[PDB]
Ligand binder design. Structure first.
Ligand SMILES: [Mg+2]
Ligand SMILES: [Mg+2]
Ligand SMILES: [Mg+2]
Ligand SMILES: [Mg+2]
Ligand SMILES: [Mg+2]
Ligand SMILES: [Mg+2]
Ligand SMILES: [Mg+2]
Ligand SMILES: [Mg+2]
Ligand SMILES: [Mg+2]
Ligand SMILES: [Mg+2]
Ligand SMILES: [Mg+2]
Ligand SMILES: [Mg+2]
Ligand SMILES: [Mg+2]
Ligand SMILES: [Mg+2]
Ligand SMILES: [Mg+2]
Ligand SMILES: [Mg+2]
Ligand SMILES: [Mg+2]
Ligand SMILES: [Mg+2]
Ligand SMILES: [Mg+2]
Ligand SMILES: [Mg+2]
Ligand SMILES: [Mg+2]
Ligand SMILES: [Mg+2]
Ligand SMILES: [Mg+2]
Ligand SMILES: [Mg+2]
Ligand SMILES: [Mg+2]
Ligand SMILES: [Mg+2]
Ligand SMILES: [Mg+2]
Ligand SMILES: [Mg+2]
Ligand SMILES: [Mg+2]
Ligand SMILES: [Mg+2]
Ligand SMILES: [Mg+2]
Ligand SMILES: [Mg+2]
Ligand SMILES: [Mg+2]
Ligand SMILES: [Mg+2]
Ligand SMILES: [Mg+2]
Ligand SMILES: [Mg+2]
Ligand SMILES: [Mg+2]
Ligand SMILES: [Mg+2]
Ligand SMILES: [Mg+2]
Ligand SMILES: [Mg+2]
Ligand SMILES: [Mg+2]
Ligand SMILES: [Mg+2]
Ligand SMILES: [Mg+2]
Ligand SMILES: [Mg+2]
Ligand SMILES: [Mg+2]
Ligand SMILES: [Mg+2]
Ligand SMILES: [Mg+2]
Ligand SMILES: [Mg+2]
Ligand SMILES: [Mg+2]
Ligand SMILES: [Mg+2]
Ligand SMILES: [Mg+2]
Ligand SMILES: [Mg+2]
Ligand SMILES: [Mg+2]
Ligand SMILES: [Mg+2]
Ligand SMILES: [Mg+2]
Ligand SMILES: [Mg+2]
Ligand SMILES: [Mg+2]
Ligand SMILES: [Mg+2]
Ligand SMILES: [Mg+2]
Ligand SMILES: [Mg+2]
Ligand SMILES: [Mg+2]
Ligand SMILES: [Mg+2]
Ligand SMILES: [Mg+2]
Ligand SMILES: [Mg+2]
Ligand SMILES: [Mg+2]
Ligand SMILES: [Mg+2]
Ligand SMILES: [Mg+2]
Ligand SMILES: [Mg+2]
Ligand SMILES: [Mg+2]
Ligand SMILES: [Mg+2]
Ligand SMILES: [Mg+2]
Ligand SMILES: [Mg+2]
Ligand SMILES: [Mg+2]
Ligand SMILES: [Mg+2]
Ligand SMILES: [Mg+2]
Ligand SMILES: [Mg+2]
Ligand SMILES: [Mg+2]
Ligand SMILES: [Mg+2]
Ligand SMILES: [Mg+2]
Ligand SMILES: [Mg+2]
Ligand SMILES: [Mg+2]
Ligand SMILES: [Mg+2]
Ligand SMILES: [Mg+2]
Ligand SMILES: [Mg+2]
Ligand SMILES: [Mg+2]
Ligand SMILES: [Mg+2]
Ligand SMILES: [Mg+2]
Ligand SMILES: [Mg+2]
Ligand SMILES: [Mg+2]
Ligand SMILES: [Mg+2]
Ligand SMILES: [Mg+2]
Ligand SMILES: [Mg+2]
Ligand SMILES: [Mg+2]
Ligand SMILES: [Mg+2]
Ligand SMILES: [Mg+2]
Ligand SMILES: [Mg+2]
Ligand SMILES: [Mg+2]
Ligand SMILES: [Mg+2]
Ligand SMILES: [Mg+2]
Ligand SMILES: [Mg+2]
Ligand SMILES: [Mg+2]
Ligand SMILES: [Mg+2]
Ligand SMILES: [Mg+2]
Ligand SMILES: [Mg+2]
Ligand SMILES: [Mg+2]
Ligand SMILES: [Mg+2]
Ligand SMILES: [Mg+2]
Ligand SMILES: [Mg+2]
Ligand SMILES: [Mg+2]
Ligand SMILES: [Mg+2]
Ligand SMILES: [Mg+2]
Ligand SMILES: [Mg+2]
Ligand SMILES: [Mg+2]
Ligand SMILES: [Mg+2]
Ligand SMILES: [Mg+2]
Ligand SMILES: [Mg+2]
Ligand SMILES: [Mg+2]
Ligand SMILES: [Mg+2]
Ligand SMILES: [Mg+2]
Ligand SMILES: [Mg+2]
Ligand SMILES: [Mg+2]
Ligand SMILES: [Mg+2]
Ligand SMILES: [Mg+2]
Ligand SMILES: [Mg+2]
Ligand SMILES: [Mg+2]
Ligand SMILES: [Mg+2]
Ligand SMILES: [Mg+2]
Ligand SMILES: [Mg+2]
Ligand SMILES: [Mg+2]
Ligand SMILES: [Mg+2]
Ligand SMILES: [Mg+2]
Ligand SMILES: [Mg+2]
Ligand SMILES: [Mg+2]
Ligand SMILES: [Mg+2]
Ligand SMILES: [Mg+2]
Ligand SMILES: [Mg+2]
Ligand SMILES: [Mg+2]
Ligand SMILES: [Mg+2]
Ligand SMILES: [Mg+2]
Ligand SMILES: [Mg+2]
Ligand SMILES: [Mg+2]
Ligand SMILES: [Mg+2]
Ligand SMILES: [Mg+2]
Ligand SMILES: [Mg+2]
Ligand SMILES: [Mg+2]
Ligand SMILES: [Mg+2]
Ligand SMILES: [Mg+2]
Ligand SMILES: [Mg+2]
Ligand SMILES: [Mg+2]
Ligand SMILES: [Mg+2]
Ligand SMILES: [Mg+2]
Ligand SMILES: [Mg+2]
Ligand SMILES: [Mg+2]
Ligand SMILES: [Mg+2]
Ligand SMILES: [Mg+2]
Lengths: 75, 116, 136, 66, 51, 177
RNA sequence: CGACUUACCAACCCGAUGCAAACUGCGAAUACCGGAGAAUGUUAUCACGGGAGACACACGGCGGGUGCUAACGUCCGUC
RNA sequence: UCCUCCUAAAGAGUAACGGAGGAGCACGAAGGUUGGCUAAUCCUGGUCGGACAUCAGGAGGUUAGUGCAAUGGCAUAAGCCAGCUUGACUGCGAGCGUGACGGCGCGAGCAGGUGCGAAAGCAGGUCAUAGUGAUCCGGUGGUUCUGAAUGGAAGGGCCAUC
RNA sequence: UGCCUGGCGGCCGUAGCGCGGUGGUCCCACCUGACCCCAUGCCGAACUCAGAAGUGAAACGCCGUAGCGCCGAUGGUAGUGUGGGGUCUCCCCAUGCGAGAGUAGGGAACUGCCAGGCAA
RNA sequence: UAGUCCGGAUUGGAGUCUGCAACUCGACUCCAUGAAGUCGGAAUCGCUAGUAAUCGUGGAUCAGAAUGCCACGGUGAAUAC
RNA sequence: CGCGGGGUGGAGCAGCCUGGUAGCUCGUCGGGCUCAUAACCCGAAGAUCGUCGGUUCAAAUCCGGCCCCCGCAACCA
RNA sequence: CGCGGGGUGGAGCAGCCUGGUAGCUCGUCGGGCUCAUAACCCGAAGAUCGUCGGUUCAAAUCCGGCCCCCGCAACCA
């Protein structure tokens, strides 16, 4: 065969889903590009990894001019 | 169109400043007149607002649209802001280059007592 | 012999020819050869069935071909073991679900149409039927 | 304009041979001398003299004259 | 290959150093960054040097 | 200077009667003149650009911008961010001063002159001229230059139809065919 | 150098019309993570210790790759 | 060995001598930050100049660009531009993800000390994802550590690094 | 109370395009100007400052219109969870869920605080 | 010391005589025009004194049409060991 | 079918595995020399690189398919 | 890993340890030569020392780096 190669899988996705209680610093979404965006009390690291900046429940929203998915946290 | 280029030039400040959840002092400049308003951290409701369009301030000045007028507004806003109970604020220049009238407004707002 | 002039990928998965067809109504011509059965028509079969039609109706009339291959079928050579790569693309096929109009015809009589579609229908593996363009 | 980077854009007097004196501003120096201007150039007469050049039959008649 | 590695040594303080890569062919001159010395606990002119 | 005052008083009033404009602002006005000089041959000789820049700097009042190549192409052998031409986008006061100096004295000095192109409009009132020689302008000394190089003038307006934009230039006693 | 004819091939566009594992201006079922509430279950769960065996699997049903939608073939998911 | 897409059955994972491509780096500006900006490709007019170099206006609007594959992402621009710079900083690190383990990754806030900004702030390299190898052994600099009777030393240790 | 502007949101196409309009007393715009503040890799075009002769052209705001975009039932169809079955590459039946596309139709957003002018 | 006030080609125009007649196809004139050419690759030609070299000039044929041919005379060399 | 290597004026070879303007030796063509031909001397033309394609700003040169040519393998039972 | 030497017209060489004057052989164009060709002979066209830095009257030359420069024995992650 000419090919027969592949990389190791990266385990990317929504780790904590909407409504779930998360602790301050908990990773909510591992992904490549900002598919989801950082809302209230949610960060965005160098890897575009969205993480909780406060102890609370995760909230998925669909707002903005371009209709993007945002992840917020509400205590 | 110019306006639309000024809105997007401002947006980065606004969207960064609403994330922090800070009370922003918006300053809309115009060839004739200058405006200024202290807006609540939510962004919807206004707490304090003043301008050269207000007759109370317009009656005093020579011409409404210059550095000496901007100071008269900048003083007026910060004079109200302290009476309401506001002190710690942010300054949203609103896509206007921080140099002339807006600087004269900002420095007057600092010299009046408003803390930023 | 019909074939795509350049594609993205050379070799395609086998897949599963399921469900009903979409090109069901007779759009262009007055008559049509609808596929009753399920199957897959090769590039050769389509040409052979076209030649059988076009020669029956002579120079007159107009024919369409609603189906096109765009699916490469691979085949492993003789005296070759399993594995050691996906086989080479030999021929090209169009997957045909039930209901799919294959050929369409116009500018001929209804009497002489059916006889021309029999000659084509004989060439094809799939069981077919005659259909007329009904107005809405 | 940015001072220092540009050359010296001084005023000067244009004076053609026709008589039309005309002050302008440009990077030349002291004075000017011209041949033609917007006035005195043959374009209003030029097009009259240039277009009416042809005529072959009368040229034949000017030789023979009978 | 090609891009070698260098030892950014401090000036005012202990012989603490940093290490960075450097392309020597394109940039033949030496670095002079202003990085933090943690022994002296202050920012200092870090000069380039060889290992 | 004088043509701007002439425009304000004499020309506008003339253009108002032609197309019965409802407002004074509806009249087409001349926005800018963009003198362009794609030297090009600067690929071989680097100084040849700086020779052109000085000549534009002499012709216009202000100094020119050295324009970089937008994309790389194999036809002329050029690459991204290479200085291929020179430009000046003069407007305002020095523009009217140049515009007089162009039409009044320079344009007459064109060699083999007859009548400038009437068809030459972009379909939006924006005119352009193409001067072959640099010597037509009286700023250049005769024993200084040593190349048959020239520029192109490009008059930008606030018009909308070349039909509308022709009258503006025609009102300045501009020579058309 | 002035220019006419044309048994003609045919983009970008339009209006139909299909196709696609590596196309998506849309989009289920189930599955899945968290929350609450009954009922039922021999704590069935999780932790830490003492022991291990096993790491050749096979077939059948649904989703597939491969093979010829060949093989009691081969290689994966879920029962 | 490492990265990307599909196969992979709408969380993660998932094989085959299944289907296609990339990596063994690059950069003191291509980092930081502040302040700006907007593209392709055509149309028409214009000197040499022509399909295309440079200019003007109009059209389209992200088909562009992203140091390199492919993917996801970006106008608040992560795009392209400038002005100062050195956060590609030392000590940490609440709390998570991902691995059998070795390991790997994301990270608000604290102490110290900088940069940029008028300040809110942002800065612990680069839009992210490849650019990489354990231990042993030995070398090089540092060092309130050890030192075979005592004082030194060698030699070890710890820290930085090859 | 209302009618007109501006500022900042909420909501992101029923909210956007085009076309047809109409508005200048303030508001906004261009416009005026270029020592001073500042600006151009050229250019007071931009950004900036000092102004009040002009206009509502452009840009903007408001009213009007379906040419598009956009929203969109009911019914059917495809698909599919579970237990069956068949003529088993593919279907079918009971029961649960139930699209997408199209169709009737909808459709020139709806608001929040705050400021100014005018009829009160 | 220049593609030159060198070269004088080539083209456009205006003509002149001859000649029944000048466009194919003449000669000359005027005007404007101003090409190649800056001493010539391998080679190679004639010439031993009024000869080579250079400047005129004539005639024959000939209505007209020589840079050819046949004659004529000016200044006047080098070299032949 | 498998893995190397090729395909360049009319001929045989460089330049090709490191993308930017293609040489060498012959032959062909023009002129010389010779009584003429050869030899010899002097100039000149002549290849878009197997083709269909991709990568690039640009491909003879990089990458892929197809079309020929040449070598080596094609084994144990 | 090193200590060492070595560095010029296009190129091979010296000259470089005792600072004041870069030669030398093939690539170079014109001659003379001969009815001619080869030779042979004569003269011409090119580096201020790979390159950058200290001192001292004068620095390829004395001394430090680089690109690097080849030699070596040692290098057993
Ligand atoms: Mg993957
Ligand atoms: Mg996998
Ligand atoms: Mg709990
Ligand atoms: Mg971070
Ligand atoms: Mg085709
Ligand atoms: Mg499927
Ligand atoms: Mg379908
Ligand atoms: Mg359809
Ligand atoms: Mg194989
Ligand atoms: Mg179409
Ligand atoms: Mg259609
Ligand atoms: Mg349709
Ligand atoms: Mg799909
Ligand atoms: Mg996709
Ligand atoms: Mg997508
Ligand atoms: Mg929908
Ligand atoms: Mg939808
Ligand atoms: Mg969606
Ligand atoms: Mg549903
Ligand atoms: Mg769902
Ligand atoms: Mg649960
Ligand atoms: Mg549950
Ligand atoms: Mg529960
Ligand atoms: Mg309970
Ligand atoms: Mg119970
Ligand atoms: Mg129980
Ligand atoms: Mg145990
Ligand atoms: Mg066990
Ligand atoms: Mg096993
Ligand atoms: Mg077994
Ligand atoms: Mg086994
Ligand atoms: Mg097995
Ligand atoms: Mg198994
Ligand atoms: Mg099965
Ligand atoms: Mg099923
Ligand atoms: Mg199914
Ligand atoms: Mg089977
Ligand atoms: Mg059995
Ligand atoms: Mg089996
Ligand atoms: Mg592995
Ligand atoms: Mg997919
Ligand atoms: Mg998947
Ligand atoms: Mg998955
Ligand atoms: Mg699944
Ligand atoms: Mg796992
Ligand atoms: Mg497995
Ligand atoms: Mg696999
Ligand atoms: Mg590889
Ligand atoms: Mg620097
Ligand atoms: Mg930069
Ligand atoms: Mg940067
Ligand atoms: Mg500043
Ligand atoms: Mg920025
Ligand atoms: Mg793109
Ligand atoms: Mg992409
Ligand atoms: Mg840049
Ligand atoms: Mg820069
Ligand atoms: Mg500074
Ligand atoms: Mg410290
Ligand atoms: Mg930690
Ligand atoms: Mg704690
Ligand atoms: Mg912890
Ligand atoms: Mg684990
Ligand atoms: Mg761990
Ligand atoms: Mg990593
Ligand atoms: Mg990393
Ligand atoms: Mg932080
Ligand atoms: Mg904290
Ligand atoms: Mg601090
Ligand atoms: Mg300090
Ligand atoms: Mg401090
Ligand atoms: Mg400091
Ligand atoms: Mg500061
Ligand atoms: Mg300040
Ligand atoms: Mg300060
Ligand atoms: Mg600070
Ligand atoms: Mg941190
Ligand atoms: Mg960063
Ligand atoms: Mg970058
Ligand atoms: Mg950046
Ligand atoms: Mg790396
Ligand atoms: Mg690696
Ligand atoms: Mg070992
Ligand atoms: Mg070992
Ligand atoms: Mg030691
Ligand atoms: Mg020490
Ligand atoms: Mg010590
Ligand atoms: Mg200690
Ligand atoms: Mg000690
Ligand atoms: Mg001790
Ligand atoms: Mg001792
Ligand atoms: Mg002892
Ligand atoms: Mg001892
Ligand atoms: Mg002892
Ligand atoms: Mg030791
Ligand atoms: Mg030690
Ligand atoms: Mg330490
Ligand atoms: Mg320590
Ligand atoms: Mg538009
Ligand atoms: Mg609009
Ligand atoms: Mg009015
Ligand atoms: Mg202005
Ligand atoms: Mg008025
Ligand atoms: Mg007014
Ligand atoms: Mg209007
Ligand atoms: Mg509206
Ligand atoms: Mg309607
Ligand atoms: Mg809606
Ligand atoms: Mg819809
Ligand atoms: Mg919707
Ligand atoms: Mg519905
Ligand atoms: Mg209903
Ligand atoms: Mg329904
Ligand atoms: Mg089913
Ligand atoms: Mg079933
Ligand atoms: Mg039963
Ligand atoms: Mg529904
Ligand atoms: Mg629906
Ligand atoms: Mg619909
Ligand atoms: Mg449709
Ligand atoms: Mg409809
Ligand atoms: Mg209704
Ligand atoms: Mg209706
Ligand atoms: Mg609408
Ligand atoms: Mg509308
Ligand atoms: Mg409305
Ligand atoms: Mg209505
Ligand atoms: Mg609505
Ligand atoms: Mg409205
Ligand atoms: Mg000449
Ligand atoms: Mg010549
Ligand atoms: Mg002549
Ligand atoms: Mg001449
Ligand atoms: Mg000469
Ligand atoms: Mg001669
Ligand atoms: Mg002579
Ligand atoms: Mg001879
Ligand atoms: Mg002779
Ligand atoms: Mg004799
Ligand atoms: Mg003579
Ligand atoms: Mg004579
Ligand atoms: Mg004679
Ligand atoms: Mg005679
Ligand atoms: Mg004669
Ligand atoms: Mg003669
Ligand atoms: Mg050959
Ligand atoms: Mg070449
Ligand atoms: Mg030959
Ligand atoms: Mg040649
Ligand atoms: Mg040819
Ligand atoms: Mg490239
Ligand atoms: Mg490349
Ligand atoms: Mg080439
Ligand atoms: Mg090459
Ligand atoms: Mg070793």
């Amino acid at each position: 065969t000419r090919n027969g190669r592949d990389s190791e899988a990266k385990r990317l996705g929504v780790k904590r889903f909407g409504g779930e209680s998360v602790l301050a610093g908990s990773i909510i979404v591992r992904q490549r590009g900002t598919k989801f965006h950082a809302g209230a009390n949610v960060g965005c690291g160098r890897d575009h990894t969205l993480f909780a900046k406060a102890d609370g429940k995760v909230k998925f929203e669909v707002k903005g001019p371009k209709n993007r998915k945002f992840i917020s946290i509400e205590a | 169109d110019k306006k639309s280029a000024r809105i997007r030039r401002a947006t980065r400040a606004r969207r960064k400043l609403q994330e922090l959840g800070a009370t922003r002092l918006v300053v809309h400049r115009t060839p004739r007149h200058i405006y200024a308003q202290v807006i609540a951290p939510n962004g919807s409701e206004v707490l304090v607002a003043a301008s050269t369009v207000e007759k109370a301030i317009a009656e005093q000045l020579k011409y409404t649209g210059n550095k000496d007028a901007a100071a008269a507004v900048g003083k007026a806003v910060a004079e109200r802001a302290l009476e309401k109970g506001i002190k710690d604020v942010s300054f949203d220049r609103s896509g206007f280059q921080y140099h002339g009238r807006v600087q004269a407004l900002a420095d007057a707002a600092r010299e009046a007592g408003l803390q930023f | 012999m019909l074939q795509p002039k350049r594609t993205k990928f050379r070799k395609m998965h086998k897949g599963r020819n399921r469900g009903l067809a979409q090109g069901t109504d007779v759009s262009f011509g007055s008559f049509g050869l609808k596929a009753v059965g399920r199957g897959r028509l090769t590039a050769r079969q389509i040409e052979a069935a076209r030649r059988a039609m076009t020669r029956a109706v002579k120079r007159q009339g107009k024919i369409w071909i609603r189906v096109f291959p765009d699916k490469p079928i691979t085949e492993k050579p003789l005296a070759v073991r399993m594995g050691k790569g996906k086989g080479n693309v030999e021929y090209w096929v169009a997957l045909i679900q039930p209901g799919k109009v294959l050929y369409e015809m116009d500018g001929v009589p209804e009497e002489l149409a059916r006889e021309a579609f029999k000659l084509a229908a004989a060439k094809l593996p799939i069981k077919t039927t005659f259909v007329t363009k009904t107005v809405m | 304009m940015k001072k220092d980077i540009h050359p010296k854009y001084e005023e000067i007097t244009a004076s053609c041979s026709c008589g039309n004196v005309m002050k302008i501003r440009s990077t030349v120096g002291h004075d000017l001398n011209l041949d033609v201007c917007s006035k005195c150039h043959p374009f209003f007469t030029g097009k009259q003299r240039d277009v009416a050049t042809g005529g072959r039959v009368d040229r034949f008649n000017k030789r023979f004259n009978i | 290959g090609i891009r070698e590695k260098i030892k950014l040594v401090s000036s005012a303080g202990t012989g603490h150093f940093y290490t960075t890569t450097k392309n020597k062919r394109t940039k033949p001159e030496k670095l002079e960054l202003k990085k933090f010395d943690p022994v002296v606990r202050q920012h200092v002119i870090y000069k380039e040097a060889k290992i | 200077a004088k043509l701007h005052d002439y425009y304000k008083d004499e020309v506008v009033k003339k253009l108002m009667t032609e197309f019965n404009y409802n407002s004074v602002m509806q009249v087409p006005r001349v926005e800018k003149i963009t003198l362009n000089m794609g030297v090009g041959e600067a690929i071989a000789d680097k100084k040849l650009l700086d020779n052109a820049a000085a000549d534009l700097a002499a012709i216009s009042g202000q100094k020119p911008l050295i324009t970089k190549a937008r994309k790389s192409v194999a036809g002329f052998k050029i690459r991204q961010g290479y200085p291929i031409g020179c430009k000046v986008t003069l407007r305002g006061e020095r523009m009217w001063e140049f515009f007089e100096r162009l039409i009044t004295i320079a344009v007459p000095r064109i060699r083999d002159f007859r009548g400038l192109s009437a068809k030459s409009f972009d379909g939006r009132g924006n005119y352009s001229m193409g001067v072959r020689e640099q010597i037509i302008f009286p700023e250049i000394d005769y024993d200084k230059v040593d190349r048959v190089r020239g520029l192109d003038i490009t008059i930008t307006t606030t018009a909308k139809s070349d039909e509308e934009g022709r009258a503006l230039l025609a009102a300045f006693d501009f020579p058309f065919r």
